[PDB]
């Protein structure tokens, strides 16, 4: 008993259901990243970039004092350095892959500047270390450390 | 969250099932899951993830599939420090903290920033903060040397073996999380994952508090191989679970037990009423078969009024009060299911409330304690049925200042609404028993409550050839203003009304609505 | 047998109900039931009674009506008599015994009779009697000087008042049972009814075995008048019941306790799973209606499952033993009612069978033990969960060889047969928590098992102008050889439908197939 | 609010349903009494007018060694005399009530010899005492007092 085929596009394209359900095909990794990117811009553009600027540290920068506390939490704990130290350890492959998934974010806000929320263009471009970053604050400073339980509230 | 697996001699045609059913805010922007596809010459994967996060947590394709729950794996330690001449104690001695001036701009009211100054200060533990209430705390989290997490999750959901998988779940880059795998060669998996710290004593409460930061002996720097940590695999029941429980029921009868571990890997905490149905909902049933699979998964029983109602009704009933007995009486009227129709239900959340705290996860209240030796029948009975008499009494006026009245049909006050969708709600409150969560706010001035948190993204899976899965997430797939794919799908949950999730080619095409061919010029 | 009355203010309609359901021997003659109607210029009175007596002990009319239970009234002591110097000591003196020589005939196999002689002694206790094991004892009952036992049934369910009903009632001529009460006036009682000696001390179970016959110590002489026994009228819960319970929530909320009366009247020991049902299947319902009244009396749950069941199938889905595993999903799956259709209740009872002894009564399995602070919620839980399991290893094992498999329809294997009808069976062992009774024989050697005791004469009446009435006779209304009305009934009583009881003389000559004019000649 | 009118009978008859249910119409409460004998009589009669029997203490002399224990039991215990005792002390009204009633059994075994089981026409006639005799000993000499709790088995 062996699995069915397993499909080989030809070219790359997403086509959508009728539920706003991406299937991303692409003829390599970095191909079916980028449409993950775009995809994901698309359907969640505003809030993805600006948790992208927070795990830049720069959250208190762009929206001011109610992202204030976050910003000291990423970085007294030096999340956006780290995030770019842990880009740089990727493989090359991957890095390529993370890198595809970026570009993929700025090309949908190229081709459509008018569905991308105002205050949240300041963050564009995003870069593949963005997309470590967010992993990471989410992973170790969301999930694992949490600031309430270091702040003890 | 929940989450199953299910061996093939479990069910009818001899496939591994399992169940992607995170639970998690229906508001908070970076807990938002979003449902996708992709397709390489080289790879397939199918589900949802985070926002933001360029590979699929919750995946699953021809051949495999994962998914994970919250195990709250202790990976960081606050240390108190004593704060002295300048520095701070450590073994006895004074010891200087690594200072790092920075600053970092603040954005006014008036869409100016002005530079504000931030001092960076770490001990030997790590970087260093300070309550409100003026405690000096060092955080210490472990795996800050782990750049992997996303390529971890990437080779595990694209593996082409179980070996692949195991050995990629091995390299500890993904630093928490309960995970569960299923393929179609028939292997399920449990695995208590993340990075915990090697240490020399104490349990995961003292790892939990404040630790002691004036002394070496509690700085740890090594961490646990995955071999360190609970894994079930293909257990003798033929199934594999997680609702958050600790890990000490994983499958039944279990594989382990908590001696078999350090102390403060995981909590020996009273199990769930939730996590207790998850293994009665497995155990047994067999024979299983997708659709009755997914039937389990709506349980919604109100476990905690089978503890209760036996001693709590016939104590109500010598009170005077003929509210008081009225309350009793539809009470025990009440087939103890959080259904729409249920007119029962919101007065016995309101009792448990108080019988069991706000978040009904209280244990003094019931008469035989919780105990490891019956996982899935304890705690119970009523201890006081006095005073639960008196807190019902209370539950009947906090019944009516919510609802309206004693007796309002829980669908009624028990609302999903999105956007212009509004339909009756089913299921509710993990903690008193419900499988299927819906974390009900606080109602509104007319009595209406809506889910806070629960169930987002649900999918079923059976491993067969091709593979065939089912799936619905509340919120839609899209959050961007003026979406129509937001308040889409809720009616369908109202209803349990799971879509099937298209992975082949020719049912893609099918459904395309939108097409969007593009150019990836590196 | 079991009891209910209820008042006005717990029904619908406002008029009173009562339920007539005695539990007695299908086969016993002098414990058959005849079902009949006396009318005359000056009462009227319709009922069952034991065959041979001249008064209706289970009757009703349109205004009033009765039923009993039995007690178990210690209206009769056994004492240990110490012989000595050809009579018996006696407060440190011999004392003669007062000796009668009699004779009676025996018949012999041919038919010829030949005298035996019989000596009849007598202690100061009463007639004396010599058991296998050599010892003497003495009984001496109660009442001996009560020749109004008939005449006071007569005047009880033909009293035009409640207040003549207790005067009658108040005579002290019937020795024992439990008597329940209802009027269309309203007026709900019950009786702890019978002839109880004073006595100065010992509990009830130290006058239930041998008392010492060397003492005047013991030697009880007055009896208690009927305002010394527990009694209740017009409850503040609105009804009345008795299921041969301790007579300690013959209504609830409860009227008194234990200590309000002398430790010897009657036990205190655990109230069946079937009373237990009774009080919460009275205290529960509200509104109620003939109809709803006589739905409830179907009642045939299997309550020790519920008691036990969340902590044996746990246990047993850990035992290797596939058919264990099974038995225990099967089980699981089950609602808990004894129906015909039930394929997990044959298992259960056999377990049973071991867990609480034969006759179910046993209380040292149990983890919570029975409590009358929680009359109706206790015994509770599987002391021992493991042991538990050897004994459903055991009981699956007696289910094969007694019926064949370990899920044959309950009602396949219960059956009913009355000459040539034979029909499904239903409901079960009351101490396994069965309301409606039918407690089941060992099966043949085809598994076929039949009622040797349980329901005879089912009666429920409304007390409306005009009442309005519904019974059935389990083994019909006749027994006498070649009978038509013997079998006649058994088959609706397998539909539990009932017949409307005619009082009224245009029902009856609707209704008359036979006529008898007869000329009593003084 | 008055209950119905009870009825007034003005000739005796036994009117029976298609179930063996008797229904006892007399002019008077002997009537009444007789014709319950009687129905009683023809329904149950065989094991009546056994008990009755065995009610006299001579369950061994009419039926042998199967029924010799309750003899000695209820001979020991002097119910057959308590019994004559207990039915020279009725009511003037009552006793013509119990004489009624074994009048009633009589006349039906007088009209209907056939249907008397043979081995227990030798019981009758049965008598006022006899109906007395039967409820002292189910009473208080079944119910209250039963031979096993006395003779220990």
Redesign the interface.
Known sequence: ????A????R??????????????????????????????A???????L???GEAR??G??????DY?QT??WL????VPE?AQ???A???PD?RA??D??A??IN?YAQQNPD?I?PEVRQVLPVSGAD??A???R????????SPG????? | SNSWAVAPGKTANGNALLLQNPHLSWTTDYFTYYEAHLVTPDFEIYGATQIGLPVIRFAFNQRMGITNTVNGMVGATNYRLTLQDGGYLYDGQVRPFERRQASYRLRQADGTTVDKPLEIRSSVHGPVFERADGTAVAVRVAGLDRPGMLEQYFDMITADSFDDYEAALARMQVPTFNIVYADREGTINYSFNGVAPKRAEGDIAFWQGLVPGDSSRYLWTETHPLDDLPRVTNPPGGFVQNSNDPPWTPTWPVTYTPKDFPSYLAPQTPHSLRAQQSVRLMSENDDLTLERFMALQLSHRAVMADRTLPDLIPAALIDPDPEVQAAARLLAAWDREFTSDSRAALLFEEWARLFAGQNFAGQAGFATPWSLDKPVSTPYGVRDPKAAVDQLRTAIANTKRKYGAIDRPFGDASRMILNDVNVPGAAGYGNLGSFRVFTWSDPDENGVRTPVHGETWVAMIEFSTPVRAYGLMSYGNSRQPGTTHYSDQIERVSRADFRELLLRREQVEAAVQERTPFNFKP
Do not use: C
Request: proline share 5%; charged share 15%; no cysteine.
């Open positions: 008993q062996a699995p069915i397993a499909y080989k596009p070219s790359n394209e997403i086509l959508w259901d009728g539920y706003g359900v991406p299937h991303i095909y692409g003829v390599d990794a970095p191909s079916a990243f980028y449409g993950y990117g775009w995809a994901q698309r359907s969640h553009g505003d809030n993805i600006r948790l992208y540290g720069k208190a920068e762009y929206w001011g004092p204030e910003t000291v970085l007294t704990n030096g780290r130290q842990w880009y350890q990727q493989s991957f892959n993370l595809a998934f570009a993929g090309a569905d929320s997309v470590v967010h992993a990471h989410l992973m170790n400073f969301l999930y694992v450390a339980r270091t702040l003890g509230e």
